[PDB]
Amino acid sequence: INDPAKSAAPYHDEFPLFRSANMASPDKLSTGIGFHSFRIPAVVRTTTGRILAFAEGRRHTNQDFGDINLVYKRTKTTANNGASPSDWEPLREVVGSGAGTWGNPTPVVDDDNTIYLFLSWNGATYSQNGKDVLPDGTVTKKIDSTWEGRRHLYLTESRDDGNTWSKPVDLTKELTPDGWAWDAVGPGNGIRLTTGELVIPAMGRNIIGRGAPGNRTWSVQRLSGAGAEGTIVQTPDGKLYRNDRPSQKGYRMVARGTLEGFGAFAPDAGLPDPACQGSVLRYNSDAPARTIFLNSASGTSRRAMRVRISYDADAKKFNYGRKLEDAKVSGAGHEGGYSSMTKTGDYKIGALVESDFFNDGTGKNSYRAIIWRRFNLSWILNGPNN
Ligand SMILES: [Cl-]
Asked: How many Å is the Cα radius of gyration of the chain?
């Protein structure tokens, strides 16, 4: 019941990291290529201490389809922990080839500091629902099971602390079941287990990496009743824990297991969710061991961002935690949406969170930005609603 972290001085700081086209100093590539919106964050700390932040750079609108590039920023040094805006490099690109969709960043850092980045891809003229109008008036086809029309799974990696990235390699035939149309990996992050394997959450399955770090053999672990957008953590007991976006608004869907198989998914009544992506983080294993969870704690709204701690060996129950709105950002829209968390080298949690200007309401022209937050366990534990 005692957590020494509560006695530490509370710390928080927050600022926009991916600045949409409507903001002052909007984020653009060195090529001059700009983006209406940034969505779908992912963040990892590498073995050097450098922080890598990934996002979908949505070129023309905030929509999930059309020309979308996979963009990123690194901390300028391995030691600055992204503490202030000046600690971050300008926007770079992992991949932006063609006018199709490169997205769903799902990174994991291997033992050798190879940073793997799993990605989803679809063609320029396809969308999840089909019949969507593109900027030039073209009407999309519905994503289907054909090679051209299906969702692909790609893998790129960096061997130089995120400085450069390989041309992404298509692993669809190997790691996506045959006959699938729609697919998703993450988005958010994969993990490295105490036992040495990599686990990457995906739609209806886990991707498992075995063998030599940065030289892994990949395989698929099929799951029953998993969601499209999943998260994975190793709980203090050493078991695996999937915490997935539900198909309908309500609660997070949770299953527990091992590399040999999982039990059933069931709603976690303690974790309301509006059918949106979430994020989970293994903080520490020594007493008191902690798992961190972040989503919108609402059955209806994405604007109820809440970070929580679980002390349970199986992460059975999370505390109330703290509303991110307790440390609100101004000038970057209405915060809430997808999120991603890492530990920093200075004993903080670093979180990326989507934000929405809502200037076009629910419409395609509403600018979307991504906020970077740092806070310590003390900040969470000293929340007024605990
Ligand atoms: Cl969504």
From this structure: 19
Report in angstroms the alpha-carbon separations of 269 from 121, 231, 253, 297: 33, 17, 9, 11
Name the experimental technique. X-ray
Q: What resolution in Å is listed for this PDB structure? A: 1.8
DSSP track, 329-343:
-SSS-EEEEEEEEEE
Pairing of strands 126-127, 141-142: parallel
Domains of the chain and any CATH numbers: 1-386 (2.120.10.10)
Q: Rounded to the nearest whole angstrom, what is the distance from the C-alpha of residue 338 to the centroid of ligand 1?
A: 8
DSSP string, 138-169: PBPEEP-SSTTTSPEEEEEEESSTTS--PPPE
Going across the sheet that includes 322-323, the strands are 279-284, 290-296, 305-310, 322-323
Contact (CB, 8 A) for 75 and 82: yes
Q: What is the DSSP string of 257-307?
A: EETTEE---EEEEEEEESS---EEEEEESSSSPEEEEEEE--SS-S--EEE
Going by the annotation, the residues of the binding site for substrate are: 39, 58, 64, 128, 245, 302-303, 311-312, 317, 338, 356-358
CB distance 277 to 188 below 8 Å:
yes
What 8-state DSSP symbol labels residue 363?
S
Residue 327 CA to residue 330 CA, distance in Å, equals 10
| C-alpha of residue 374 to centroid of ligand 1, in Å | 25
Cα 212 to ligand 1 centre (Å): 35
Q: What is the DSSP string of 115-135?
A: EEEEEEEE-TTEESSS-PBPT
64 CA → ligand 1 middle, Å: 8
- How remote is the CA of residue 25 from the centroid of ligand 1, in Å? 27
DSSP 379: H
